[PDB]
Amino acid sequence: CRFYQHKFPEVEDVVMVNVRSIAEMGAYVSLLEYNNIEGMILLSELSRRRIRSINKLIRIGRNECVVVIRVDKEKGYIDLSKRRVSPEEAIKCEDKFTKSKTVYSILRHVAEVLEYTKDEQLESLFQRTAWVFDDKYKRPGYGAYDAFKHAVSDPSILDSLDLNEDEREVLINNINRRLTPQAVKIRADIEVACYGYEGIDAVKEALRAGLNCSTETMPIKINLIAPPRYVMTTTTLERTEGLSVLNQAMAVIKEKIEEKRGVFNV
Amino acid sequence: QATINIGTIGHVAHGKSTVVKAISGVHTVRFKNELERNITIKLGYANAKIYKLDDPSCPRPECYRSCGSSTPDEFPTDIPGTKGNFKLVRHVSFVDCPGHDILMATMLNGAAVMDAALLLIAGNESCPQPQTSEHLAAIEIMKLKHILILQNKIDLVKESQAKEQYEQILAFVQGTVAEGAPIIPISAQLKYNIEVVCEYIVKKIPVPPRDFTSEPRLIVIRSFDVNKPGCEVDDLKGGVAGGSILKGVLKVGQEIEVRPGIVSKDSEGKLMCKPIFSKIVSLFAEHNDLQYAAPGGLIGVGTKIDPTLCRADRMVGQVLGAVGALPEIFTELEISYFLLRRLLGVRTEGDKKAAKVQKLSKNEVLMVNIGSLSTGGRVSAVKADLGKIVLTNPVCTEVGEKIALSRRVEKHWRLIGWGQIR
Amino acid sequence: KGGKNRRRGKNENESEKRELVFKEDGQEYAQVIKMLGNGRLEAMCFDGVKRLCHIRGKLRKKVWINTSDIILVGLRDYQDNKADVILKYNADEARSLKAYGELPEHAKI
RNA sequence: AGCAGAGUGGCGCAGCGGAAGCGUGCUGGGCCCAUAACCCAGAGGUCGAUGGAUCGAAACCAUCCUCUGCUACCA
């Protein structure tokens, strides 16, 4: 069924297709960036340079990024072109192609149980759920994946509008399985060069105080990579909440060790 | 623990691992392993237990027989006795010094804390070989004469060649003690006559008088690889010094001071140095726990110093005294000295070169090996029997003892003379 | 060649197969060492003596003697260093001669 | 041992959320009177193990092992 918010493409929009035949006059191709509607590419507007081979360019069974040059709205002729394509558009379109595939796979679990004897089943599910998720956040550059990703980490998004059954478990499982494990790249940077002998116990007091105002029972990940370097991967959230945990903790270890003898790295 | 330190010094290409494993049973090993471009060029460590079945031969644990594995060309077998437990005679310690000429300053340092030696001669090269003489002379200067020459590589060397070599060495060294030192030819490819070596080292080398009552002094020569394992970091519960003690029974929990010191921040001169103080965590020797560390033995003293001082070999030739030791920490020093009339440690097949070296000139950098310390320093005043030297890093002078003085002849320093501090 | 033309005005051909002199007196088997130009060429004899081989009439552009391979060489009656090519063989013929045991068993093809 | 890569389906390099990806080679065909250049065509097959989501996993994501790259120590 449709993979996109609108059924028909517009004018000058970047899309994706999959080649199913090669024509004399260009390439007649099916879309997989929308419905399986037909769109015709023309030979002239594929490149601005010569062309020796022809199967080392376009061939069957390839996703190809393209621009919709014209569309007949009533007839359903989607004129197409590969002449204006930049690699930056390919990154943006590959993401939207891949994200729609995963979102429609989530909106396939819904159809496994419900009445789907007719092809239009998924279309019924798509219009009513998809649009209110993505339309509210299309202007900021988000897909319906953002709405679902927000629901798993704070559940009020999918309870603000009609909640389905049995969907919720598989929805949670698939969001939490695929978009994790989930991750902190927090590493402490600490340098010490002691003349102390009481440094061994001094470091222990400093290590356990990586995060202030936490319980004595807080689990953390200590790492020793080299003798002066003390890496502490602090409490694992998303690395946008443990910023204060990373920054101010570094001051503790370097200060605690200077009090017991000599100068150290700051 | 240990009772005596026998050193295993010997010039290039005689094989160290075969002989060292036969005497101690503990491999000589160090950084870069790897193995060894030839023979060990690091300061190796090893201890061993010497027992008897009431026989001059020394057993293995399996004391019924011993079948070697030195070569599969033939089977070398020896018989120490038969089994029913063996009586412990003593615990011995070794000091494997560098076998290569460039490493002379290190060989000197390591040597200077031994109580006896084993000159490992190799029959492959020249008969009055440079390094044999170099070693021997240094040994008689430091205060030892408990030497057992060992002909360590005469496996394929014919009996005329090997006979000529022992003769020429013993005839060149006509002014250095060596006539009361035995010369034991051995095999190192079939480990033969090893049993008779065991008889020699208990005969020629008893325990010399050790002063327990006198104040502890530990001379550290080797650092420690502590720490960085797990679990619980960082840096360590600290740092281990491989040192021998030459005076005093160092007891566990005692505080010890490393006396060459660390220099004060923003010094405009050559003074001031401040000793570092560390409490003794543990007194480990062999593989057996101890509460004491008797003198005359090479012991691993774990102390409460932190990883940076032991992360590399940086505690070579440091003097440690318990605690607030009286020994002066000179930065500029008054050497009395004398020179050899030959250049020691160099002499090849053809007169080229080895003769009389010219007199020292002021503002030249020379290695003064004082104690086990190795510092570099420049000569500020040069009279024949009174030179004044200024040293880069301060030297703790335990006693006025001896010194060894070397001059940069070419690529590296070479031994020119000795003397005594005033 | 790759077909072409003007290659039929002249006597096709071929080696209807055939057979088999030797050696004779100063007329023996050698192996091509190098492959000079102009015309001449190098070839070490199978006995042990080196020599420099020379092409012979007819065999000029009527038979190509690629590098490496047995070949029949007359020796000059008086000259040592330079020698004179005869009568080449076939690689199959050379391995049959080797299997017979008449030339020395030292060179590979 | 910290970090990185990989654990062939011809080779070599190993590409990404669709079951050989890229470059190359070998073998065959085409073009040409012929060669080169140029154009096409190939090939038994969980891609080290133990698991989860999945329609499916070298490849989506984990838990383990091994080999190496850089850094580097316990031994």
Please give the single-letter amino acid code of residue B281. Answer: V
Chain A residues closer than 8 Å to B305 by CB:
197
Judged by DSSP in three states, A70 sits in strand
How many angstroms separate the Cα of A15 from the Cα of each of A57, A71, A158, B36, B243? 18, 13, 29, 66, 76
CA A197, distance to chain mean position in Å, is: 50
Residue located via tokens 């060294």: B173
Residue located via tokens 């390439």: A27
Distance measured from the CA of protein residue B225 to the C1' of nucleotide D1, in angstroms: 14
Q: What gap in Å lies between CA B406 and CA B339, rounded to an integer?
A: 10
Judged by DSSP in three states, A130 sits in helix
**Structure determined by:** cryo-EM
With beta carbons less than 8 A apart as the criterion, state whether B278 and B262 touch: no
Domain of residue A23: give its range: 13-87
Number of domains chain B contains? 3
Strand D closer than 7 Å to the CB of B33? Answer: yes
Question: Structure resolution in Å?
Answer: 3.0
Q: Which of B237, B262, B303 lies closest to A195 in CB terms? A: B262
Domain of residue B79: give its range: 5-204
How many angstroms separate the Cα of B149 from the Cα of each of B44, B174, C12? 20, 15, 91
Judged by DSSP in three states, B230 sits in coil
- Boundary (domain end) residue, out of B139, B171, B204: B204
Q: Is residue B212 situated within a structural domain?
A: no
How many angstroms separate the Cα of A177 from the Cα of each of A137, A147, B64? 24, 17, 66
Q: What gap in Å lies between CA B405 and CA B105, rounded to an integer?
A: 10
Q: What gap in Å lies between CA B252 and CA B281, rounded to an integer?
A: 7
Angle between helices A144-153 and A167-178 (to 10 degrees): 100
- Boundary (domain end) residue, out of B173, B204, B235: B204
Q: What gap in Å lies between CA A34 and CA A116, rounded to an integer?
A: 20
Does residue B38 sit in the same domain as residue B145? yes
Does residue A111 sit in the same domain as residue A49? no
Nearest residue to B221 via CA among B287, B320, B304: B320
CATH number at residue B319: 2.40.30.10
Judged by DSSP in three states, A113 sits in helix
- Boundary (domain end) residue, out of B289, B305, B328: B328
How many angstroms separate the Cα of B391 from the Cα of each of A118, B331, B418? 96, 6, 17
Residue located via tokens 């003596």: C49
Nearest residue to B37 via CA among B22, B7, B16, B10: B16
Q: What gap in Å lies between CA A257 and CA A201, rounded to an integer?
A: 10
Beta strands in chain A (DSSP E): 14-19, 26-31, 38-42, 63-72, 77-81, 221-224, 230-233
**Per the structure block, which two tokens stand in for A73?**
């709205």
Does residue B319 sit in the same domain as residue B338? no
Does residue A113 sit in the same domain as residue A82? no
**DSSP designation for A139:** T
The H or E element that residue B414 is part of is: strand B413-421
Judged by DSSP in three states, A147 sits in helix
Please give the single-letter amino acid code of residue C89. Answer: Y
Which among B306, B309, B310, B323 is the top mutation candidate for probing chain A, defined by the most A β-carbons within 10 Å of its own β-carbon?
B306
Q: Which residues of B touch A (CB under 8 A)?
A: 227-228, 230, 232-238, 262, 265, 276-279, 303-308, 311
Q: What gap in Å lies between CA A73 and CA B112, rounded to an integer?
A: 99
Which among A190, A194, A198, A200 is the top mutation candidate for probing chain B, defined by the most B β-carbons within 10 Å of its own β-carbon?
A200
Q: Is residue B209 situated within a structural domain?
A: no
Query: What values do phi and psi take at B29, rounded to 5?
Result: -155, 165
Chain B residues closer than 8 Å to A197 by CB:
238, 277-279, 303-306
**Per the structure block, which two tokens stand in for A132?**
């209110």
Distance measured from the CA of protein residue A233 to the C1' of nucleotide D70, in angstroms: 23
Judged by DSSP in three states, B375 sits in strand
Q: Domain residues of chain C, as ranges?
A: 1-109
Query: What values do phi and psi take at A3, rounded to 5?
Result: -105, -5
Give the nucleotide with minimal C1' distance to the Cα of B229.
Answer: D74
Query: What values do phi and psi take at A172, rounded to 5?
Result: -60, -50
Q: What gap in Å lies between CA B54 and CA A260, rounded to an integer?
A: 57
DSSP B316-340: TTEEEESSS---EEEEEEEEEEEE-
Domain C1-109, CATH class in plain words: mainly beta
Chains touching A, CB cut-off 8 Å, 3+ pairs = B
